[PDB]
């Protein structure tokens, strides 16, 4: 019940390891190219967006956010995701460790 995913600053999946299948039901190709917020519960999207705004401002240190994720089987899974940017000093990407709770 844990998988890694790297994103761009906009929140778009650019990689996701195969443990996502077991975690949320989707194949990696199904997620790649999409914004994580598209899979996020409407009530939680503002909270999630606000996360992606701050990791970029901190540049290095780690944030954490709790939100509901719509699975392939169409049920709302509680995900605790920890995020942080990676510096080269601009930004290459945001890594995320999504954990189902």
């Amino acid at each position: 019940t844990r998988f890694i995913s790297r994103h761009n600053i906009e929140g778009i999946f650019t990689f996701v390891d195969h443990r996502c299948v077991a975690t949320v039901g989707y194949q990696p190709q199904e997620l790649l190219g999409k914004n994580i917020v598209e899979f996020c519960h409407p009530e939680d999207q503002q909270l999630l967006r606000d996360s992606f705004q701050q990791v970029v401002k901190l540049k290095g240190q780690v944030l954490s956010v709790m939100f509901r994720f719509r699975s392939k089987n169409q049920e709302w899974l509680w995900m605790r995701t920890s995020s942080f940017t990676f510096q080269n000093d601009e930004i290459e990407y945001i890594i995320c460790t999504n954990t189902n709770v």
Binding site: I4, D17, H18, P28, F86
Partner: protein, 49 residues
């Protein structure tokens, strides 16, 4: 005559499965390469710290 056709079929089956295996293998290599990148970058990031 009829025997050739049986082997001819069993060959292409074999060859199908192999191509199918190296499909899995091809997408399974992408995953390795991409994780190595992330991993090397976590070593590099944690070293500054």
């Amino acid at each position: 005559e009829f025997e050739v056709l049986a082997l001819q079929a069993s060959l292409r089956k074999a060859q199908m499965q192999n191509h199918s295996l190296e499909m899995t293998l091809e997408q399974k290599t992408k995953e390795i390469d991409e994780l190595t990148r992330i991993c090397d970058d976590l070593i590099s990031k944690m070293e500054k710290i």
